[PDB]
Ligand binder design. Structure first.
Ligand code: MTA
Length: 349
């Protein structure tokens, strides 16, 4: 006998060759419509010109029932392989250029998205997921708030969580970005100072957070590191991090829950002080006062202020009756015309 038409109609083996032609101002509306109705063809790319977009569809009869103009076109096939290296490869320049730098913490991607391009959130998320297929959370960042410098963060894709375990320089760092400050970009600096350190040193790190600096130093050197942190949630994670890394640390770490400006005057002095100073805070006198051989003092300085910065460090050295060599390094581009810097102070005997 013969077959039912509603069985035969699925048998055609060829590929779809049609799309719908829509005004650009209608493109987002129509893309949503095509997906909801279920006739968007994932096999092919959409294309555009100056005025119109063409979406690939799987059923032109249904497209007509949606009031859409059907066109016969030769659209590109979806890519089977990927060779994108960076975000710029996946976004138009007008969008990418407005994006802040992207940071990865554990399996969380963090990016700043100005209100002006927030309307492009979908393609931004798509681009980030493509570039980082292992990321499980994407968050939009604002500024740091409060004494603990917690970053304003909104999850815009993935799991609704801001805690993860970050890997750096051979150590494991538990972080909860909803509760503590963390600085992934300091990876190079932390490794640098860890290599400079010598076995046997006693080292102080004020403003220590979940103690990434003490962990990286103690990973590579048999030293004792005192860490001072005021945020009790950061202290908790620091304790958990110490236990998490305990069997891989050569050195020892002492975590002190407290206010740096209260704690340091009551401490003994140290061979080396490493101060990842909160932006805007001046802890130069106090941290130098605890150093016997080396201070590494981080700060944020406008380029035109860079020389004044060095002379202020030298002034404090003389003020404390110390003879020092001071070297200033640009550590990172913080924003236009402003650098994160480090004063390396060598105290001479
Ligand atoms: C950018 S701030 C870096 C870390 O220093 C901590 N911090 C800020 N001020 C102090 C202080 N006075 N004493 C101890 N830790 C501090 C913050 O909670 C954060 O974890």
């Amino acid at each position: 006998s013969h077959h039912h038409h509603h069985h035969l109609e699925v048998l055609f083996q060829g590929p779809h060759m049609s799309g719908v032609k829509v005004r650009r101002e209608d493109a987002k509306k129509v893309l949503e419509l095509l997906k909801s109705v279920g006739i968007l063809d994932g096999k092919r790319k959409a294309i555009r010109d100056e005025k119109y977009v063409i979406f690939p569809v799987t059923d032109t009869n249904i497209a007509k029932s949606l009031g859409l103009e059907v066109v016969d076109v030769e659209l590109p096939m979806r890519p089977e392989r990927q060779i994108y290296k960076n975000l710029e490869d996946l976004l138009p320049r007008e969008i990418f250029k407005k994006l802040g730098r992207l940071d990865i913490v554990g399996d969380i991607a963090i990016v700043s998205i100005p209100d002006e391009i927030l309307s492009e959130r979908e393609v931004i998320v798509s681009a980030i997921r493509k570039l980082y297929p292992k990321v499980k959370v994407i968050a939009r960042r604002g500024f740091h708030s409060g004494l603990y410098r917690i970053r304003e963060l909104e999850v815009i894709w993935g799991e609704n969580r801001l805690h993860t375990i970050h890997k750096e320089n051979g150590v494991l760092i538990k972080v909860d970005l909803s509760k503590v400050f963390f600085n992934p970009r300091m990876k190079g600096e932390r490794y640098r100072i860890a290599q400079l350190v010598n076995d046997g040193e006693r080292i102080l790190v004020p403003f220590a957070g979940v103690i990434p600096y003490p962990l990286v130093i103690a990973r590579f050197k048999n030293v004792e590191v005192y860490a001072v942190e005021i945020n009790e949630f950061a202290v908790k994670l620091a304790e958990e991090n110490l236990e998490l890394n305990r069997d891989r640390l050569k050195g020892k770490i002492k975590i002190i829950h407290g206010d740096v400006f209260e704690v340091l005057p009551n401490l003994p002095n140290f061979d080396r002080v490493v101060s990842p100073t909160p932006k805007g805070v001046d802890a130069l006198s106090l941290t130098l006062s605890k150093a016997e051989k080396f201070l590494h003092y981080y700060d944020f300085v406008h380029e035109s202020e860079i020389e004044r910065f060095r002379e202020r460090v030298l002034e404090e050295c003389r003020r404390q009756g110390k003879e020092c060599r001071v070297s200033v390094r640009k550590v990172s581009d913080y924003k236009p015309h402003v650098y994160k810097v480090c004063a390396d102070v060598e105290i001479l005997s």
